[PDB]
Amino acid sequence: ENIASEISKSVEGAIQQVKNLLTLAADRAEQIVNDLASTTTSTITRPIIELSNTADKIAEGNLEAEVPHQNRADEIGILAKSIERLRRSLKVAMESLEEALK
Amino acid sequence: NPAENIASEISKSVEGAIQQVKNLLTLAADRAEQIVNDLASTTTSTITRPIIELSNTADKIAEGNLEAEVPHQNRADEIGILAKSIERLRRSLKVAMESLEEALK
Ligand SMILES: [Mg+2]
């Protein structure tokens, strides 16, 4: 075409290459949400739900099992040790009540 | 105009636009980096703070304060479910302790 078209169109390819890299970056940024939902589920949700279910089983009268994940180094481990304290208190109380029967 | 080369006149004419593109890309990278500290703050307020409060309450109950108020029972997420489980556990232990106290009289 004319000089203005020859010069201006010569940068179109480069601009598309810049856009391709920006599209890859935007797609990678978007992925963070679903990956963070998965990490939260495995790291936090499942252990919290497991601990709540264990607390319910203990409150219902099942004292045979030590509370799982007491050795975990984060706040979930601190919580699991606290629930273990309740389980041990309930176990002592139940054993003393059994010694009082008949 | 002191410019001696058309290649320099044309190529320099887009420098301002290119620097703007780069500055916006630097601002995007800086905004992305801010996500980490924000996510540590969200996790602390949403999860850490109530979990530690629940663990402290569980300890107080195990130590003998059977009347300790279990916080966050009205919460709509899994922390609320956990809090309600600790409340049922407090009720069960309270009954167990009172039953023993009465049996030994
Ligand atoms: Mg018997």
From TrEMBL, chain B:
Residues 45-98 form the HAMP domain. It is found in: Cell membrane. Zn(2+) binds at E53, H72. Mg(2+) binds at E101. This is histidine kinase. The lineage of its organism: Archaea, Methanobacteriati, Methanobacteriota, Archaeoglobi, Archaeoglobales. The chain holds residues 234 to 338 of 338 of the full protein.
